[PDB]
Amino acid sequence: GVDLTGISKKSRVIRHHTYSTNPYIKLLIKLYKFLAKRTSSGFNKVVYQRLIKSRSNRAPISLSRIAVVMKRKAVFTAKSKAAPIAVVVGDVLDDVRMARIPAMRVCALRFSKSARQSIVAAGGECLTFDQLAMIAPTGKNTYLLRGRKSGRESVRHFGASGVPGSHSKPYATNRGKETKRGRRTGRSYKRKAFRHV
Amino acid sequence: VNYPKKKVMHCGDARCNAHKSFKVVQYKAGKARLFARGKRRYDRKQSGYGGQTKPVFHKKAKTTKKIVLKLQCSGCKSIRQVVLKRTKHFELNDKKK
Amino acid sequence: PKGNNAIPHVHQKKHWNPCSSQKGNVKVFLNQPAQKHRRRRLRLLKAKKVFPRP
Amino acid sequence: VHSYGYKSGTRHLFAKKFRKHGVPSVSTILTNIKVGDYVDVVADSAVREGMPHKYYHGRTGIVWNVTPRGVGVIINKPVRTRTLRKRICVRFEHVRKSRCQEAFKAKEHQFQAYLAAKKAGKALPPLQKSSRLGGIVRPKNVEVLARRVADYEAMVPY
Amino acid sequence: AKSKNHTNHNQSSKNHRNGIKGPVPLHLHNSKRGSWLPALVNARRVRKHNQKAALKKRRERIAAFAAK
RNA sequence: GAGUACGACCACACUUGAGUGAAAACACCAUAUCCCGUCCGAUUUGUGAAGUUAAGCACUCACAGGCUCAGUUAGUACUGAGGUCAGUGAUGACUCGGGAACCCUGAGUGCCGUACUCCU
RNA sequence: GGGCGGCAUAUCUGUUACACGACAACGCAGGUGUCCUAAGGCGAGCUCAGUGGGAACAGAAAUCUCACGUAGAACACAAGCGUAAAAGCUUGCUUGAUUAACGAUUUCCAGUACGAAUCGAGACUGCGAAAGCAAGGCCAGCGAUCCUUUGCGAAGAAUAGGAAAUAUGAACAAAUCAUACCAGAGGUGUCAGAAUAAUUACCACAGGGAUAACUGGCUUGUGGCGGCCAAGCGUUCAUAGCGACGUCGCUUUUUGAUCCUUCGAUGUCGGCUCUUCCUAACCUAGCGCCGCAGAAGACGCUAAGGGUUGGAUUGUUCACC
RNA sequence: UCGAACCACCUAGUAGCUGGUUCACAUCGAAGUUUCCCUCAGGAUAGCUGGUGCUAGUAGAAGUAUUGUGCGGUAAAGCAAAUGAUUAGAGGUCGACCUAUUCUCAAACUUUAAAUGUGCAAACAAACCGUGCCUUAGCCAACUGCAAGGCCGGAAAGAAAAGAAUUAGAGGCACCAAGUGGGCCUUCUUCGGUAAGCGGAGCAGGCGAUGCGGAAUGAACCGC
RNA sequence: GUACUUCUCUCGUACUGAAAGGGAGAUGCAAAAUGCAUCUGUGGUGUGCACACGUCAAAUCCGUUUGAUUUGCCCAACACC
Ligand SMILES: C#CCOc1ccc(C[C@H]2NC[C@H](O)[C@H]2OC(C)=O)cc1
Ligand SMILES: [K+]
Ligand SMILES: [K+]
Ligand SMILES: [K+]
Ligand SMILES: [Mg+2]
Ligand SMILES: [Mg+2]
Ligand SMILES: [Mg+2]
Ligand SMILES: [Mg+2]
Ligand SMILES: [Mg+2]
Ligand SMILES: [Mg+2]
Ligand SMILES: [Mg+2]
Ligand SMILES: [Mg+2]
Ligand SMILES: [Mg+2]
Ligand SMILES: [Mg+2]
Ligand SMILES: [Mg+2]
Ligand SMILES: [Mg+2]
Ligand SMILES: [Mg+2]
Ligand SMILES: [Mg+2]
Ligand SMILES: [Mg+2]
Ligand SMILES: [Mg+2]
Ligand SMILES: [Mg+2]
Ligand SMILES: [Mg+2]
Ligand SMILES: [Mg+2]
Ligand SMILES: [Mg+2]
Ligand SMILES: [Mg+2]
Ligand SMILES: [Mg+2]
Ligand SMILES: [Mg+2]
Ligand SMILES: [Mg+2]
Ligand SMILES: [Mg+2]
Ligand SMILES: [Mg+2]
Ligand SMILES: [Mg+2]
Ligand SMILES: [Mg+2]
Ligand SMILES: [Mg+2]
Ligand SMILES: [Mg+2]
Ligand SMILES: [Mg+2]
Ligand SMILES: [Mg+2]
Ligand SMILES: [Mg+2]
Ligand SMILES: [Mg+2]
Ligand SMILES: [Mg+2]
Ligand SMILES: [Mg+2]
Ligand SMILES: [Mg+2]
Ligand SMILES: [Mg+2]
Ligand SMILES: [Mg+2]
Ligand SMILES: [Mg+2]
Ligand SMILES: [Mg+2]
Ligand SMILES: [Mg+2]
Ligand SMILES: [Mg+2]
Ligand SMILES: [Mg+2]
Ligand SMILES: [Mg+2]
Ligand SMILES: [Mg+2]
Ligand SMILES: [Mg+2]
Ligand SMILES: [Mg+2]
Ligand SMILES: [Mg+2]
Ligand SMILES: [Mg+2]
Ligand SMILES: [Mg+2]
Ligand code: NA
Ligand SMILES: [Zn+2]
């Protein structure tokens, strides 16, 4: 025998196939699996990994977020160079809080109907991942983007709300209930809002 | 325990903001009202058949009570309550030993 | 163990379930399509009787 | 029987050394403690104000807070499967400046001095040679190592 | 019927299976909350000015890049 | 080579006897109207300068007691790891490592700062 | 086992505890539910316990005086630690034992409360010439929800709820009344907190060999049986016979200790009957030795082949005749 | 059928207790411990375990060393050192009392004091250098001095040489949950007990959950 | 069953307070007890995929790839404000 204590703890949960039943997702995975192994680009490898990911791990992105980070890169970019193609492995959703956006080329798995209308009306173009593979096979001049997930309600519930320093929402259908003892100093004690780590 | 009849302490009222002489009086609980909300609920619960509807405490263990003092500022007439440690014999004595 | 869950208030502590010893207290809607057809049939029958009144 | 109070089992821990009793000296009072310093948390039994708990006695940590009479020290403490960074509040008399980085600080300063000397035509000190190498040995005196009869009679008392 | 009162047997083995994790580094979770207030208040004034300096500095860099 | 004031470390600086002490200090010392405090100008406080190194103080001495650093005690006591080692056992030795303490004995008997002053 | 007892039920000191921390027992030795307007705070002076010398009545011990005195005293109460121009004693003035914007932390620990602490920021102060020192007496001395009860939201200003006027009783106003928000107090000692007397042999159920009573098993304190040494006893003479003070064993025919097996069951004492086995040998076969004349006996060795009774009383085993 | 008859019903009454619980292979794989509970045959709660992953694949690594730098009062030793215990002479009618030492000791005694341990550090968000620059209602009588947050530069055996580390050395972050919460045996340490295949602990291995090869035979011994 | 419809209802886009009741952008200029101006914009800082500029090392079938690193922007996240 060989002493291999805790060797199984070194292994990691790595998925190679997708759980998706979408045939067009499988076509994209087939296309970008080929590109991630026959090209040297790091963009194709990252895109291929994100196509295998679950829906929860492909958070959607707002149109205002794309335009903001595009402007942060538009400055400090030479006028000779064209703007990169924004690529997100996920959904692009419209944002009613920002009406005036520049013309951008956006590639995404799915566009909401309003988001596609807003991109086109600004002079931009909504791209498709098989179109991207033909104009940027190695991902040259692209802006890979991810949607936000820290604001999800599931994340806001994670952890115990009764321990000091915690601010997670409890699981409760009634908002008025679960507010008296343990939440106010007058009723026995209050859960401490801050704790040094 | 012997306690002075007058105490000079800080009066936090906006018209004093200084150390003033306070008259010392032991706190005594007031009478239970008949029309306090909990009393009204208790009387409604106790009516009719069913006997004693609430617990009645019996296993007394303490032999003392915490001492509470009502201190009244001479000028503002406001009252402040302070808590002393438990004692078996609390006495207000101006005569220093 | 229990874990972090909502405190349940599902009620259902009465004799609602029909079984032996309990008639139950339930109401299903398996007759909903048939009653919907009947109501439309009755409305069309009534219009013929009161014709030409609205 | 046995109890677990704040100062339980500290009969020898919180005691002065023999003939070394007394309150802290002036040099302790004049010592400057800054945020980010390394300090050893050694309780002074003659100052029964702001003493650390007996666990933190003999632990070295990093100062995170300085207050008119007190020092905030972050101390690692293993609990079950992890180590927590515990912040303790003590008076200044219970902390000593730690020399735990003295060898590392000297190593850095030697490198700077060597670099400056090498930069501008100075003679570097000669490199020390290993003592484990071979060589010829000329013995001035040679003695016989043996067990004698006298050795056996010398270990018998009475 | 009496049972065992207490033992620490197997506990160190359990605590080392997923190992005893090291402490968080000093540069993380270095909150100043609860520290000496007079120094905390003064540090906030400097940090507020530093943010204003950072905002202005990016404005100069953007103009300088557009200058060429 | 010394003194004074403030000191750092806090006996190699302490304790007991004995001797010596330039200068300038320090100190004993004189006194009680005022400031002040006491049973008592003893201590303390004020005002002084006639006297004295007699004490304090500083040095030096002692096969001095302590204390400090070494050596011995001693690779001893103890101890981490090992044996299908010895022994009925009590226990012990062995192998790879670590390693004391008192007694006893040798040497030593403060040191380092800031300011002012004497020697000058 | 349970019961009775006690409390190891909440909690403090020393030790067990194996020189970080942590560690059990109905382990060991002791504590806690209080006490204190000072026994809290501060400043200043002083030095304690004990000795030795001396002083009318005065002595072992009354008070006065001089030396010595590292704490050998004291600091409410257990213990440890700490402390000498103090942390002890005396004294003078005091209320830092108040308030303290939900600051942070430690101990227990799930890194939750509670109780105790620690480091702070603000107000008003007490002492001090001042640096400073104090928000109790360092470390044990205490309490959730609901309910009850108390304090705080003074008066006067605002053309409009504002930077600053507590709120509600939901059609609207006034005055009561009742609520609400914040901080305490009345208590749970089974001390993270039900409101609780017996009996059952007339008894019942679910279970437990997690747990007693009976057989076995481990142990052998106790019981029983023996050795070794040799003070004495034996007129004399330690050892014919035996053997104090000690010490080393064996046995499982006594009791105790334990709780491994059995609680969906291993039929409980005694006797009767019948067989077999052991030897630490009563008789029977040999043989030594003697305080061995004989007779009768004592002690010892080899040997379990053979034998080891009839009755009164008692259920008895034992016991006694 | 009687210390509360019989018949039907509520009633499939409740049971922390006893019994049962139906196919295969594969990848992983425990716990009998903590805290709270009218809690002790049971639960919650951490820990151990699986699944799902997330994140820039050597990153904030380590049940191990070395070198520096801290902590300690057990083994030992000592009583000719404090606190307790204690035998005997000697030196200053009998003794007492002093002075010196001497026979023997301590879980709740110690001057001293290990071995084994235990905390921290050993250059990539860091540290070092330029009285370089900005800011502050911070400190100081002020200041170019200290404190703090930054900015701009410089240098960086990326850590030499002296025995001068090594790694089957991808670090961090989550989510959802199961069983378990009767243990037992050995090595050293160790408490009660005359002792026990007895009761109770510390460290670490092991059985439980595991066979195989050996000690004839044996859950735990030896080897593996 | 399938096809069709809803000025509704519900869960969210806003949360706080016991309630009366209030109710969240950035930058600049400035300090008005409701201050002004502008609207293509991550509030700031540290660590941070890809991508873009380079710059080294190794290997190349000489086309490149495969590691490291500088600078810019940094997505998602984490930590201080
Ligand atoms: C009263 C009394 C003491 O005497 C006894 C006598 C018999 C028993 C029965 C047990 N003997 C072994 C098994 O455990 C049980 O067997 C059975 C058939 O139940 C218990 C105690
Ligand atoms: K208001
Ligand atoms: K049975
Ligand atoms: K015979
Ligand atoms: Mg959100
Ligand atoms: Mg679990
Ligand atoms: Mg559980
Ligand atoms: Mg859940
Ligand atoms: Mg029926
Ligand atoms: Mg100890
Ligand atoms: Mg100690
Ligand atoms: Mg047992
Ligand atoms: Mg148990
Ligand atoms: Mg003189
Ligand atoms: Mg003289
Ligand atoms: Mg230890
Ligand atoms: Mg310990
Ligand atoms: Mg006093
Ligand atoms: Mg004093
Ligand atoms: Mg508390
Ligand atoms: Mg207390
Ligand atoms: Mg105090
Ligand atoms: Mg006091
Ligand atoms: Mg106290
Ligand atoms: Mg105090
Ligand atoms: Mg209590
Ligand atoms: Mg309890
Ligand atoms: Mg009868
Ligand atoms: Mg059974
Ligand atoms: Mg049993
Ligand atoms: Mg039997
Ligand atoms: Mg026996
Ligand atoms: Mg027996
Ligand atoms: Mg039994
Ligand atoms: Mg039977
Ligand atoms: Mg059976
Ligand atoms: Mg039978
Ligand atoms: Mg025989
Ligand atoms: Mg025979
Ligand atoms: Mg026979
Ligand atoms: Mg009948
Ligand atoms: Mg149960
Ligand atoms: Mg079963
Ligand atoms: Mg496996
Ligand atoms: Mg039990
Ligand atoms: Mg069970
Ligand atoms: Mg069971
Ligand atoms: Mg010993
Ligand atoms: Mg010794
Ligand atoms: Mg002694
Ligand atoms: Mg000891
Ligand atoms: Mg490696
Ligand atoms: Mg058990
Ligand atoms: Mg919301
Ligand atoms: Mg509202
Ligand atoms: Na089992
Ligand atoms: Zn007043």
Short mmCIF file of N, CA and C (backbone and C1' of nucleotides) in Angstrom, two decimals, chain D residues 1-11 14 16 21-22 46 48 50 54-56 59 67 69-70 77 80 82 84 86-87 89, chain G residues 12-16 20-24 28-29 80-83 87 105-107 109-111 118-121 133 138-140:
data_model
loop_
_atom_site.label_atom_id
_atom_site.label_comp_id
_atom_site.label_asym_id
_atom_site.label_seq_id
_atom_site.Cartn_x
_atom_site.Cartn_y
_atom_site.Cartn_z
N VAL D 1 -15.86 21.29 43.28
CA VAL D 1 -14.50 20.90 42.93
C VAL D 1 -13.84 21.98 42.09
N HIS D 2 -13.11 21.56 41.06
CA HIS D 2 -12.42 22.49 40.18
C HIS D 2 -13.41 23.45 39.53
N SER D 3 -13.01 24.72 39.43
CA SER D 3 -13.83 25.77 38.85
C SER D 3 -13.09 26.40 37.68
N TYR D 4 -13.83 27.13 36.85
CA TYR D 4 -13.26 27.80 35.68
C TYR D 4 -13.63 29.27 35.75
N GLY D 5 -12.89 30.02 36.55
CA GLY D 5 -12.99 31.46 36.57
C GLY D 5 -12.00 32.08 35.60
N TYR D 6 -11.96 33.41 35.61
CA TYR D 6 -11.09 34.12 34.68
C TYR D 6 -9.63 33.81 34.94
N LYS D 7 -9.23 33.74 36.21
CA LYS D 7 -7.84 33.53 36.59
C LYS D 7 -7.60 32.16 37.21
N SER D 8 -8.33 31.14 36.77
CA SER D 8 -8.16 29.81 37.34
C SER D 8 -6.86 29.19 36.85
N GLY D 9 -6.19 28.46 37.74
CA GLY D 9 -4.97 27.76 37.38
C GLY D 9 -3.80 28.65 37.01
N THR D 10 -3.67 29.80 37.67
CA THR D 10 -2.61 30.75 37.37
C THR D 10 -1.71 31.00 38.57
N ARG D 11 -1.59 30.00 39.46
CA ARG D 11 -0.79 30.18 40.67
C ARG D 11 0.67 30.45 40.33
N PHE D 14 0.88 33.62 36.91
CA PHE D 14 0.79 35.03 37.28
C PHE D 14 1.52 35.28 38.60
N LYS D 16 5.61 36.64 40.13
CA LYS D 16 6.93 37.18 39.84
C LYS D 16 8.01 36.13 40.06
N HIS D 21 10.48 40.90 42.28
CA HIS D 21 9.19 41.52 42.50
C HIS D 21 9.27 43.02 42.23
N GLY D 22 8.10 43.65 42.13
CA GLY D 22 8.04 45.08 41.93
C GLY D 22 7.20 45.50 40.74
N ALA D 46 2.08 42.25 38.94
CA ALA D 46 2.00 43.39 39.85
C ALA D 46 1.09 44.49 39.33
N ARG D 48 -2.54 44.60 38.20
CA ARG D 48 -3.80 43.88 38.03
C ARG D 48 -4.86 44.77 37.40
N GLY D 50 -6.10 45.60 33.29
CA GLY D 50 -5.90 45.30 31.88
C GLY D 50 -5.00 44.11 31.64
N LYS D 54 -5.18 34.26 30.66
CA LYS D 54 -4.02 33.39 30.80
C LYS D 54 -3.63 32.71 29.49
N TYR D 55 -4.57 32.56 28.55
CA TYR D 55 -4.22 31.95 27.27
C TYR D 55 -3.23 32.80 26.50
N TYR D 56 -3.44 34.11 26.47
CA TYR D 56 -2.64 35.00 25.64
C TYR D 56 -1.29 35.32 26.24
N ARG D 59 2.09 34.81 24.07
CA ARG D 59 1.81 34.84 22.65
C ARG D 59 2.26 36.17 22.06
N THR D 67 -4.17 53.22 22.35
CA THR D 67 -5.06 54.04 23.16
C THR D 67 -4.26 54.59 24.33
N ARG D 69 -3.82 54.46 27.47
CA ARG D 69 -3.17 53.53 28.38
C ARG D 69 -3.17 52.10 27.87
N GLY D 70 -3.79 51.83 26.73
CA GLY D 70 -3.98 50.46 26.28
C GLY D 70 -3.41 50.16 24.92
N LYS D 77 -5.44 32.26 17.34
CA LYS D 77 -5.89 31.27 18.31
C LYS D 77 -6.61 30.13 17.59
N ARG D 80 -10.99 24.47 17.04
CA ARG D 80 -11.43 23.36 16.20
C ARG D 80 -10.61 23.27 14.92
N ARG D 82 -9.96 25.73 12.61
CA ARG D 82 -9.43 26.97 12.06
C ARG D 82 -8.77 27.77 13.18
N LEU D 84 -8.57 31.64 14.69
CA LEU D 84 -9.22 32.94 14.73
C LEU D 84 -8.22 34.02 15.11
N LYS D 86 -7.90 36.88 17.27
CA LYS D 86 -8.54 37.48 18.44
C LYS D 86 -7.87 38.80 18.77
N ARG D 87 -8.68 39.84 18.96
CA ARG D 87 -8.19 41.15 19.36
C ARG D 87 -8.38 41.31 20.86
N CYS D 89 -7.54 43.54 24.49
CA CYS D 89 -7.29 44.87 25.01
C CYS D 89 -6.56 44.75 26.34
P C G 12 -16.92 29.93 37.80
"O5'" C G 12 -16.07 30.26 39.10
"C5'" C G 12 -15.88 31.60 39.54
"C4'" C G 12 -15.15 31.67 40.85
"C3'" C G 12 -13.87 30.86 40.95
"O3'" C G 12 -12.76 31.48 40.33
"C1'" C G 12 -15.16 30.52 42.89
"C1'" U G 13 -9.62 29.19 44.70
"C3'" U G 13 -8.35 29.57 42.75
"C4'" U G 13 -9.27 30.75 42.99
"O3'" U G 13 -7.12 29.92 42.15
"C5'" U G 13 -10.01 31.28 41.78
"O5'" U G 13 -10.69 30.26 41.08
P U G 13 -11.54 30.59 39.79
P G G 14 -6.37 28.87 41.20
"O5'" G G 14 -5.76 27.80 42.22
"C5'" G G 14 -4.77 28.18 43.16
"C4'" G G 14 -4.42 27.03 44.08
"C3'" G G 14 -4.06 25.72 43.41
"O3'" G G 14 -2.74 25.68 42.91
"C1'" G G 14 -5.56 25.31 45.17
"C1'" U G 15 -4.38 20.30 43.58
"C3'" U G 15 -2.49 20.42 42.19
"C4'" U G 15 -2.32 21.38 43.34
"O3'" U G 15 -1.27 19.85 41.76
"C5'" U G 15 -1.82 22.76 42.99
"O5'" U G 15 -2.60 23.35 41.96
P U G 15 -2.41 24.88 41.56
P U G 16 -1.08 19.42 40.22
"O5'" U G 16 -1.93 18.09 40.08
"C5'" U G 16 -1.68 16.96 40.91
"C4'" U G 16 -2.81 15.96 40.83
"C3'" U G 16 -3.14 15.44 39.45
"O3'" U G 16 -2.27 14.40 39.04
"C1'" U G 16 -5.13 16.02 40.57
P C G 20 2.90 22.81 29.44
"O5'" C G 20 2.14 24.16 29.06
"C5'" C G 20 2.78 25.42 29.20
"C4'" C G 20 2.15 26.48 28.33
"C3'" C G 20 0.64 26.63 28.43
"O3'" C G 20 0.24 27.38 29.56
"C1'" C G 20 1.29 26.63 26.15
P G G 21 -0.94 26.87 30.51
"O5'" G G 21 -2.22 26.82 29.57
"C5'" G G 21 -2.84 28.01 29.10
"C4'" G G 21 -3.84 27.71 28.01
"C3'" G G 21 -4.89 26.66 28.35
"O3'" G G 21 -5.97 27.18 29.09
"C1'" G G 21 -3.93 26.15 26.27
P A G 22 -6.63 26.31 30.27
"O5'" A G 22 -7.36 25.05 29.51
"C5'" A G 22 -8.45 25.31 28.68
"C4'" A G 22 -8.80 24.02 27.89
"C3'" A G 22 -8.98 22.83 28.85
"O3'" A G 22 -10.28 22.71 29.19
"C1'" A G 22 -7.58 22.09 27.24
P C G 23 -10.70 22.37 30.70
"O5'" C G 23 -10.50 20.80 30.81
"C5'" C G 23 -11.22 19.90 29.98
"C4'" C G 23 -10.75 18.49 30.18
"C3'" C G 23 -10.73 18.00 31.62
"O3'" C G 23 -12.00 17.50 32.00
"C1'" C G 23 -8.71 17.40 30.51
P A G 24 -12.74 18.01 33.32
"O5'" A G 24 -13.58 16.74 33.78
"C5'" A G 24 -14.24 15.91 32.84
"C4'" A G 24 -14.31 14.48 33.31
"C3'" A G 24 -14.62 14.30 34.79
"O3'" A G 24 -16.01 14.34 35.04
"C1'" A G 24 -12.77 12.95 34.19
P C G 28 -13.45 12.84 47.70
"O5'" C G 28 -12.08 13.56 48.04
"C5'" C G 28 -10.91 12.80 48.30
"C4'" C G 28 -9.70 13.69 48.46
"C3'" C G 28 -9.90 14.93 49.31
"O3'" C G 28 -9.84 14.66 50.69
"C1'" C G 28 -8.77 15.51 47.32
P A G 29 -10.88 15.35 51.70
"O5'" A G 29 -10.39 16.86 51.77
"C5'" A G 29 -9.08 17.18 52.21
"C4'" A G 29 -8.82 18.66 52.16
"C3'" A G 29 -9.97 19.55 52.58
"O3'" A G 29 -10.10 19.65 53.98
"C1'" A G 29 -8.98 20.39 50.59
P G G 80 -3.40 30.31 50.17
"O5'" G G 80 -2.90 30.69 48.71
"C5'" G G 80 -2.56 29.69 47.76
"C4'" G G 80 -2.64 30.20 46.34
"C3'" G G 80 -1.85 31.45 46.04
"O3'" G G 80 -0.47 31.20 45.82
"C1'" G G 80 -4.01 31.65 45.12
P C G 81 0.64 32.23 46.34
"O5'" C G 81 0.58 33.43 45.29
"C5'" C G 81 0.78 33.21 43.90
"C4'" C G 81 0.27 34.37 43.09
"C3'" C G 81 0.84 35.73 43.44
"O3'" C G 81 2.10 35.97 42.84
"C1'" C G 81 -1.51 35.88 43.26
P G G 82 3.23 36.80 43.63
"O5'" G G 82 2.69 38.29 43.63
"C5'" G G 82 2.44 38.98 42.42
"C4'" G G 82 1.69 40.27 42.68
"C3'" G G 82 2.31 41.18 43.72
"O3'" G G 82 3.32 42.01 43.16
"C1'" G G 82 0.00 40.93 44.16
P U G 83 4.66 42.32 43.98
"O5'" U G 83 4.26 43.54 44.92
"C5'" U G 83 3.73 44.74 44.39
"C4'" U G 83 2.98 45.53 45.43
"C3'" U G 83 3.73 45.82 46.72
"O3'" U G 83 4.59 46.93 46.61
"C1'" U G 83 1.53 45.06 47.21
P A G 87 -0.77 52.72 46.68
"O5'" A G 87 -1.70 51.45 46.89
"C5'" A G 87 -2.97 51.53 47.53
"C4'" A G 87 -3.49 50.17 47.92
"C3'" A G 87 -2.86 49.56 49.17
"O3'" A G 87 -3.80 48.66 49.76
"C1'" A G 87 -2.32 48.23 47.31
P U G 105 -15.87 43.24 18.51
"O5'" U G 105 -14.89 42.78 19.68
"C5'" U G 105 -13.51 42.61 19.43
"C4'" U G 105 -12.70 42.57 20.71
"C3'" U G 105 -12.88 41.35 21.59
"O3'" U G 105 -12.19 40.21 21.12
"C1'" U G 105 -12.89 43.29 22.92
P U G 106 -12.81 38.74 21.34
"O5'" U G 106 -12.27 38.29 22.76
"C5'" U G 106 -10.91 38.46 23.13
"C4'" U G 106 -10.73 38.31 24.62
"C3'" U G 106 -11.33 37.05 25.23
"O3'" U G 106 -10.50 35.91 25.09
"C1'" U G 106 -11.90 38.93 26.54
"C1'" U G 107 -13.49 34.74 29.43
"C3'" U G 107 -12.68 32.66 28.62
"C4'" U G 107 -11.58 33.70 28.56
"O3'" U G 107 -12.20 31.37 28.96
"C5'" U G 107 -10.81 33.77 27.27
"O5'" U G 107 -11.68 33.95 26.16
P U G 107 -11.14 34.48 24.76
P C G 109 -15.92 26.12 26.96
"O5'" C G 109 -16.75 26.60 25.69
"C5'" C G 109 -18.16 26.46 25.64
"C4'" C G 109 -18.74 27.35 24.57
"C3'" C G 109 -18.15 27.17 23.19
"O3'" C G 109 -18.75 26.10 22.49
"C1'" C G 109 -18.21 29.48 23.73
P A G 110 -18.09 25.47 21.18
"O5'" A G 110 -19.28 25.50 20.13
"C5'" A G 110 -19.07 25.23 18.75
"C4'" A G 110 -20.04 26.00 17.89
"C3'" A G 110 -19.72 27.48 17.73
"O3'" A G 110 -20.11 27.92 16.43
"C1'" A G 110 -21.84 27.23 18.78
P G G 111 -19.07 27.85 15.21
"O5'" G G 111 -17.79 28.64 15.74
"C5'" G G 111 -17.73 30.06 15.68
"C4'" G G 111 -18.18 30.69 16.97
"C3'" G G 111 -18.44 32.20 16.92
"O3'" G G 111 -19.68 32.50 17.55
"C1'" G G 111 -16.98 31.67 18.72
P U G 118 -11.85 45.57 34.84
"O5'" U G 118 -11.04 45.68 33.47
"C5'" U G 118 -10.05 44.73 33.15
"C4'" U G 118 -9.65 44.83 31.70
"C3'" U G 118 -9.63 46.22 31.11
"O3'" U G 118 -8.49 46.97 31.48
"C1'" U G 118 -10.70 44.76 29.61
P C G 119 -8.58 48.56 31.59
"O5'" C G 119 -8.46 49.05 30.08
"C5'" C G 119 -7.37 48.63 29.27
"C4'" C G 119 -7.59 49.01 27.83
"C3'" C G 119 -8.09 50.42 27.59
"O3'" C G 119 -7.11 51.43 27.71
"C1'" C G 119 -9.36 48.93 26.30
P G G 120 -7.51 52.82 28.39
"O5'" G G 120 -8.97 53.10 27.82
"C5'" G G 120 -9.32 54.36 27.27
"C4'" G G 120 -9.92 54.22 25.89
"C3'" G G 120 -10.76 55.39 25.42
"O3'" G G 120 -9.98 56.46 24.92
"C1'" G G 120 -11.91 53.37 24.98
P A G 121 -10.25 57.96 25.42
"O5'" A G 121 -11.55 58.41 24.61
"C5'" A G 121 -11.50 58.65 23.22
"C4'" A G 121 -12.84 59.05 22.69
"C3'" A G 121 -13.58 60.10 23.50
"O3'" A G 121 -13.15 61.43 23.27
"C1'" A G 121 -15.04 58.32 23.05
P C G 133 -3.38 57.92 34.98
"O5'" C G 133 -4.13 57.30 36.24
"C5'" C G 133 -3.41 57.08 37.44
"C4'" C G 133 -4.32 57.19 38.63
"C3'" C G 133 -5.72 56.66 38.42
"O3'" C G 133 -5.76 55.25 38.53
"C1'" C G 133 -5.82 58.76 39.51
P C G 138 -11.41 44.36 45.38
"O5'" C G 138 -10.72 44.42 43.94
"C5'" C G 138 -11.26 45.23 42.91
"C4'" C G 138 -11.12 44.59 41.56
"C3'" C G 138 -11.69 43.20 41.41
"O3'" C G 138 -13.10 43.20 41.26
"C1'" C G 138 -9.56 43.30 40.39
P C G 139 -13.92 41.82 41.36
"O5'" C G 139 -13.54 41.07 40.00
"C5'" C G 139 -13.72 39.67 39.86
"C4'" C G 139 -12.51 39.02 39.24
"C3'" C G 139 -12.40 37.52 39.44
"O3'" C G 139 -13.12 36.81 38.44
"C1'" C G 139 -10.33 38.55 39.98
P A G 140 -14.10 35.62 38.84
"O5'" A G 140 -14.72 36.07 40.30
"C5'" A G 140 -16.06 36.43 40.38
"C4'" A G 140 -16.81 35.25 41.04
"C3'" A G 140 -18.15 35.72 41.63
"O3'" A G 140 -19.11 35.64 40.68
"C1'" A G 140 -17.23 34.24 43.10
#
